[PDB]
Design an enzyme around this catalytic site. Structure first.
Site: not given
Lengths: 139, 139
Positions: A63, A83, A90, A92, A107-109
């Site tokens: 993040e 966010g 997860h 390993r 995707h960048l909207g």
């Protein structure tokens, strides 16, 4: 050329001052036209009580990386980014070394960004995969 | 009576020694027959660079709480538990105070546990919701 603001690694790292990312040793490491990379130590700062990398720590890395990537892709005089949704498998467990994350755009909207983030330990085996949805918000 | 091992708050807290949970100020606060509660400070340790609680920090709290809850629900001489999948919606930003998480069981199966984790700031408004899937693993 994914980026609006050209990634400046020193400034990325410096900007983490007095935040969780600095506290956890997250370091922005590399970038190219399609990706941004950060790593994080696997030690006591990031361990869960049984000495394995905490799954939430993976998500702090992902993040941190994704949100920073989003900041490099919007008009920062017009918008900020928070966010909205995050998820991760997860894969390993990791006990030592560093974990390295690479973020790529799905995707960048105009109002949302979706980032694919891939994590692996120093043996190069996939340790975690995350998908991050950022909200793009007008100040 | 959700629990196999009766929650001992002092020991829960003590067990975090030298892990991320201790580093972030996560504190196990309360429990009842159906839930376990922990809180975490919202400050520089947990902030993202813009001074809002890092979304990943919410997930460290949720996953710390859920994984601990899972440990209290298995036969620890026969099994341990690791995070398998985690997801969260970030609902409201937090700048200061503490964030409080409550975990309740959705499903406790033989090989997986699913936990519903609800977070809120000191004003009591929902700040985040998470769902955590733990894997139950034989040593």
């Amino acid at each position: 050329s994914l980026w609006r603001q050209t990634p400046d690694l020193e400034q990325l790292n410096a900007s983490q001052k007095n935040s969780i990312g600095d506290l956890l040793g997250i370091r922005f490491e590399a970038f190219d036209d399609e990706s941004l990379t950060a790593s994080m130590p696997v030690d006591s700062r990031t361990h869960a009580p049984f000495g394995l990398l905490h799954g939430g720590a993976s998500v702090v890395l992902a993040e941190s990386l994704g949100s920073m990537a989003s900041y490099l892709c919007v008009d920062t005089s017009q918008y900020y980014c928070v966010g909205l949704e995050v998820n991760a498998n997860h894969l390993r467990g990791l006990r030592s070394g560093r974990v390295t994350a690479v973020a790529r755009a799905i995707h960048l909207g105009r109002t949302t960004h979706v980032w694919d983030i891939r994590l692996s330990g120093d043996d190069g085996k996939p340790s975690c995969i995350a998908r991050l949805t950022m909200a793009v918000v007008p100040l």
